[PDB]
Write an enzyme that holds these catalytic residues in place. Sequence first.
Site, PDB file in Angstrom:
ATOM      1  N   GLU A 271       0.802  -1.235   0.000  1.00  0.00           N
ATOM      2  CA  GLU A 271       0.000   0.000   0.000  1.00  0.00           C
ATOM      3  C   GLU A 271       0.842   1.296   0.000  1.00  0.00           C
ATOM      4  O   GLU A 271       0.500   2.295   0.662  1.00  0.00           O
ATOM      5  CB  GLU A 271      -0.941   0.019   1.205  1.00  0.00           C
ATOM      6  CG  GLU A 271      -0.273   0.055   2.567  1.00  0.00           C
ATOM      7  CD  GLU A 271      -0.020  -1.313   3.226  1.00  0.00           C
ATOM      8  OE1 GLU A 271       0.081  -1.358   4.462  1.00  0.00           O
ATOM      9  OE2 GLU A 271       0.149  -2.330   2.539  1.00  0.00           O
ATOM     10  N   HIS A 295      -8.225  -4.078  -1.385  1.00  0.00           N
ATOM     11  CA  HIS A 295      -7.402  -4.188  -0.171  1.00  0.00           C
ATOM     12  C   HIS A 295      -6.397  -3.014  -0.089  1.00  0.00           C
ATOM     13  O   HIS A 295      -6.325  -2.308   0.923  1.00  0.00           O
ATOM     14  CB  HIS A 295      -6.710  -5.557  -0.095  1.00  0.00           C
ATOM     15  CG  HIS A 295      -5.958  -5.793   1.181  1.00  0.00           C
ATOM     16  ND1 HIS A 295      -6.531  -6.417   2.270  1.00  0.00           N
ATOM     17  CD2 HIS A 295      -4.716  -5.439   1.562  1.00  0.00           C
ATOM     18  CE1 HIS A 295      -5.648  -6.475   3.252  1.00  0.00           C
ATOM     19  NE2 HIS A 295      -4.546  -5.861   2.860  1.00  0.00           N
ATOM     20  N   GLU A 296      -5.634  -2.821  -1.147  1.00  0.00           N
ATOM     21  CA  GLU A 296      -4.596  -1.790  -1.158  1.00  0.00           C
ATOM     22  C   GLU A 296      -5.247  -0.395  -1.028  1.00  0.00           C
ATOM     23  O   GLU A 296      -4.772   0.464  -0.295  1.00  0.00           O
ATOM     24  CB  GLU A 296      -3.762  -1.950  -2.434  1.00  0.00           C
ATOM     25  CG  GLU A 296      -2.966  -3.266  -2.475  1.00  0.00           C
ATOM     26  CD  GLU A 296      -2.221  -3.609  -1.185  1.00  0.00           C
ATOM     27  OE1 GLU A 296      -1.769  -2.669  -0.518  1.00  0.00           O
ATOM     28  OE2 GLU A 296      -2.041  -4.838  -0.859  1.00  0.00           O
ATOM     29  N   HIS A 299      -6.168   0.377   2.530  1.00  0.00           N
ATOM     30  CA  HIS A 299      -5.053   0.753   3.399  1.00  0.00           C
ATOM     31  C   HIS A 299      -4.747   2.271   3.393  1.00  0.00           C
ATOM     32  O   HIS A 299      -4.005   2.752   4.253  1.00  0.00           O
ATOM     33  CB  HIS A 299      -3.817   0.049   2.943  1.00  0.00           C
ATOM     34  CG  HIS A 299      -3.570  -1.298   3.568  1.00  0.00           C
ATOM     35  ND1 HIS A 299      -3.161  -1.441   4.858  1.00  0.00           N
ATOM     36  CD2 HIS A 299      -3.739  -2.558   3.106  1.00  0.00           C
ATOM     37  CE1 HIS A 299      -2.951  -2.719   5.137  1.00  0.00           C
ATOM     38  NE2 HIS A 299      -3.194  -3.414   4.059  1.00  0.00           N
ATOM     39  N   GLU A 318      -4.092  -4.782   9.355  1.00  0.00           N
ATOM     40  CA  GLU A 318      -4.617  -5.789   8.435  1.00  0.00           C
ATOM     41  C   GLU A 318      -6.048  -6.228   8.660  1.00  0.00           C
ATOM     42  O   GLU A 318      -6.793  -6.356   7.712  1.00  0.00           O
ATOM     43  CB  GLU A 318      -3.653  -6.969   8.365  1.00  0.00           C
ATOM     44  CG  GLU A 318      -2.232  -6.574   7.919  1.00  0.00           C
ATOM     45  CD  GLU A 318      -2.226  -5.865   6.592  1.00  0.00           C
ATOM     46  OE1 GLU A 318      -3.208  -6.017   5.817  1.00  0.00           O
ATOM     47  OE2 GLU A 318      -1.259  -5.157   6.304  1.00  0.00           O
ATOM     48  N   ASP A 375       9.278 -10.979   9.043  1.00  0.00           N
ATOM     49  CA  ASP A 375       9.090 -11.812   7.862  1.00  0.00           C
ATOM     50  C   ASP A 375       8.856 -13.286   8.158  1.00  0.00           C
ATOM     51  O   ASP A 375       8.196 -13.983   7.348  1.00  0.00           O
ATOM     52  CB  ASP A 375      10.269 -11.715   6.909  1.00  0.00           C
ATOM     53  CG  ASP A 375      10.374 -10.352   6.262  1.00  0.00           C
ATOM     54  OD1 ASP A 375       9.315  -9.772   5.956  1.00  0.00           O
ATOM     55  OD2 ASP A 375      11.478  -9.822   6.029  1.00  0.00           O
ATOM     56  N   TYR A 383      -4.669 -10.985   9.502  1.00  0.00           N
ATOM     57  CA  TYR A 383      -5.687 -10.710   8.463  1.00  0.00           C
ATOM     58  C   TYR A 383      -7.040 -11.273   8.866  1.00  0.00           C
ATOM     59  O   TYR A 383      -8.049 -10.582   8.899  1.00  0.00           O
ATOM     60  CB  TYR A 383      -5.263 -11.307   7.078  1.00  0.00           C
ATOM     61  CG  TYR A 383      -4.027 -10.620   6.477  1.00  0.00           C
ATOM     62  CD1 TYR A 383      -2.732 -10.917   6.929  1.00  0.00           C
ATOM     63  CD2 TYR A 383      -4.167  -9.651   5.502  1.00  0.00           C
ATOM     64  CE1 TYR A 383      -1.629 -10.291   6.418  1.00  0.00           C
ATOM     65  CE2 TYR A 383      -3.074  -9.008   4.972  1.00  0.00           C
ATOM     66  CZ  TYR A 383      -1.790  -9.304   5.444  1.00  0.00           C
ATOM     67  OH  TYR A 383      -0.679  -8.623   4.946  1.00  0.00           O
TER      68      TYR A 383
HETATM   69  C1  LIG Z   1      -0.054 -13.322   1.504  1.00  0.00           C
HETATM   70  C2  LIG Z   1       0.193 -12.106   0.621  1.00  0.00           C
HETATM   71  N1  LIG Z   1      -0.536 -10.981   1.110  1.00  0.00           N
HETATM   72  C3  LIG Z   1      -0.620  -9.811   0.406  1.00  0.00           C
HETATM   73  O1  LIG Z   1       0.071  -9.615  -0.571  1.00  0.00           O
HETATM   74  C4  LIG Z   1      -1.246  -8.642   1.117  1.00  0.00           C
HETATM   75  C5  LIG Z   1      -2.270  -8.028   0.151  1.00  0.00           C
HETATM   76  C6  LIG Z   1      -3.386  -8.987  -0.208  1.00  0.00           C
HETATM   77  C7  LIG Z   1      -4.529  -9.030   0.562  1.00  0.00           C
HETATM   78  C8  LIG Z   1      -5.476 -10.028   0.322  1.00  0.00           C
HETATM   79  C9  LIG Z   1      -5.341 -10.974  -0.689  1.00  0.00           C
HETATM   80  C10 LIG Z   1      -6.342 -12.046  -0.915  1.00  0.00           C
HETATM   81  C11 LIG Z   1      -6.469 -12.628  -2.216  1.00  0.00           C
HETATM   82  C12 LIG Z   1      -7.403 -13.641  -2.452  1.00  0.00           C
HETATM   83  C13 LIG Z   1      -8.176 -14.174  -1.400  1.00  0.00           C
HETATM   84  C14 LIG Z   1      -8.008 -13.629  -0.099  1.00  0.00           C
HETATM   85  C15 LIG Z   1      -7.092 -12.590   0.145  1.00  0.00           C
HETATM   86  C16 LIG Z   1      -4.151 -10.995  -1.423  1.00  0.00           C
HETATM   87  C17 LIG Z   1      -3.220  -9.983  -1.193  1.00  0.00           C
HETATM   88  C18 LIG Z   1      -0.087  -7.749   1.510  1.00  0.00           C
HETATM   89  P1  LIG Z   1      -0.500  -6.174   2.322  1.00  0.00           P
HETATM   90  O2  LIG Z   1      -1.366  -6.564   3.578  1.00  0.00           O
HETATM   91  O3  LIG Z   1      -1.233  -5.097   1.499  1.00  0.00           O
HETATM   92  C19 LIG Z   1       1.055  -5.481   3.080  1.00  0.00           C
HETATM   93  C20 LIG Z   1       1.939  -6.580   3.720  1.00  0.00           C
HETATM   94  N2  LIG Z   1       0.675  -4.463   4.035  1.00  0.00           N
HETATM   95  C21 LIG Z   1      -0.291 -12.442  -0.825  1.00  0.00           C
HETATM   96  O4  LIG Z   1      -1.462 -12.512  -1.191  1.00  0.00           O
HETATM   97  O5  LIG Z   1       0.731 -12.657  -1.655  1.00  0.00           O
HETATM   98 ZN   LIG Z   2      -2.917  -5.363   3.972  1.00  0.00          ZN
END
Ligand SMILES: C[C@H](NC(=O)[C@H](Cc1ccc(-c2ccccc2)cc1)CP(=O)(O)[C@H](C)N)C(=O)O
Ligand SMILES: [Zn+2]
Length: 610
Positions: A271, A295-296, A299, A318, A375, A383
């Site tokens: 984000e 999501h982004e 944030h 989150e 990490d 989440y």
């Molecule tokens: C596990 C990893 N998570 C993410 O990339 C999230 C952003 C995010 C949020 C939700 C989803 C999501 C997609 C499909 C179903 C459920 C959730 C995917 C990415 C990263 P973010 O919380 O914006 C950052 C770390 N603040 C990933 O997906 O590679």
């Molecule tokens: Zn996030």
Amino acid sequence: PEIVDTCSLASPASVCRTKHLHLRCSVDFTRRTLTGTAALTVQSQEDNLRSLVLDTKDLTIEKVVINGQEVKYALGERQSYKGSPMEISLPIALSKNQEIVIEISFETSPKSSALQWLTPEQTSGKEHPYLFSQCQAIHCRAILPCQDTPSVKLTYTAEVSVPKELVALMSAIRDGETPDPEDPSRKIYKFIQKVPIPCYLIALVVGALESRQIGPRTLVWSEKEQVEKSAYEFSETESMLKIAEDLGGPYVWGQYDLLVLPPSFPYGGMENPCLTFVTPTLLAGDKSLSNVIAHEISHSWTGNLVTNKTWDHFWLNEGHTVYLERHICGRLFGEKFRHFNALGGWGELQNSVKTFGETHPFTKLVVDLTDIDPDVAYSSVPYEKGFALLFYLEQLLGGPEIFLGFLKAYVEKFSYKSITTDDWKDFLYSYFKDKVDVLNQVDWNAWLYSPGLPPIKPNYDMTLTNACIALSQRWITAKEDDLNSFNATDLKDLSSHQLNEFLAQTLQRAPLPLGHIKRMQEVYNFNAINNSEIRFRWLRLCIQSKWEDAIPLALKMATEQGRMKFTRPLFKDLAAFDKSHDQAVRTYQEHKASMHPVTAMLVGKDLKVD
Ligand SMILES: C[C@H](NC(=O)[C@H](Cc1ccc(-c2ccccc2)cc1)CP(=O)(O)[C@H](C)N)C(=O)O
Ligand SMILES: [Zn+2]
Ligand SMILES: [Yb+3]
């Protein structure tokens, strides 16, 4: 009321606070180093302040200048993933609230944990190199010296010199470009971030980037090869921003641009203010993975305006973002769809809790990251346990309209601030003063501080989930003589999301018999699906069910992109399959030097190498 940040070696906010960073730097692709000066405007919070300490990690310090003269400093010994503390001796003792500027001359290491340097052959266009950053949680210290804690918020300006054929972008508003007077083979790109941010939101990309407008306040940026496809994929961005503003209040950051990174970007999204970074694995062709964008976007309020004071309180960032995200998707596609997504998330929380184990400290909502690399602790828990607490509270307190009232007031209350779980809980109680009796029914200690699944599961509408479960149960309960019954028509009425959820349900019971999985390919041709979420779960199911034909497919997906969500479990699954184990380790060894540093570290740990 001392809340110190145990992931930072710097002076805490109670001692001094960074107000502003002026970064002037040059990106040297020949050496894989960023060199420059970080001028920090620092305000003392104490009487008679004579020194302070900053975070660094693998930084070379050339000098430190205050009032036009070099000053004494010392780097302490490395403390593992936290890096090395840098103590600076101030030339004149400061009064409380006095501000000075400290100009540090530094150079990063090629091995910077914040950075990935890509050769031309690692990019789409094959003619130019590429650099991208990823500071969250505690990697900003691997770019520049700073108080590397989200308990401090600063504005920034930056000027970045790059080879003239390349483009730099940052988490900021663009403020022009000029030829670099000290080297005409280079350009200087300028940036201003006027809104105070935690330093983990600092971000930089340098590469052969082009842009296309997709809304009134959004350009998509990528290499030329990905621009058209990205514009279509993310065309719902402006509609999602408008819904987010309705829910959260005004969007304060000016532009909302998107950058689609090369495939080794470790996350789905990040984000970075003004410039969200996303994985190219979102490019499904049908916008089906756009909840990542919602999501982004979300944030921009939860995380970027209201921020976790330390990473122990990461769930605030989150959980709230997942909550807002799922309302955006609910506004766009309906409440039954919000409930479907919510219930999926519970399933992912089940998976995570099963993986760590039900008593594991990383399954608590509020975690203690003293001597834990963030990490390493990172998971779906903050989440989905976070979201589940909020959804539970929503149901307890009178429904989504009422709970969205709280969410907006919460954002308003804590905007531009950094907060703890107790600040959140205190505000929840204040807002809902007339429902305190209902609030006092929640088992706060278990929800916030205990490991495992939450003590209570919310209520979920099942409408869109039922078909997925039914079909999964048919497969699991099938014997050999039932395999003939399955057919492509089974999938007729399932959306891509429902296909995914069918696979997730089935993967929860893996392995299945090999003959079942072969029949699934025969009738459903899941090998043909390029949707990364679907393909990921299908290949996991195939490898866990010991289908040797899937080995080259899983290896391919694990290496041709680098989103840790997909790359980590694929490599781990391949390692646990005796037929693919040696090749999984060999492949990791062969690729490790050209992987993202964090991804490399974690896959190594997963595989028990080095
Ligand atoms: C596990 C990893 N998570 C993410 O990339 C999230 C952003 C995010 C949020 C939700 C989803 C999501 C997609 C499909 C179903 C459920 C959730 C995917 C990415 C990263 P973010 O919380 O914006 C950052 C770390 N603040 C990933 O997906 O590679
Ligand atoms: Zn996030
Ligand atoms: Yb039978």
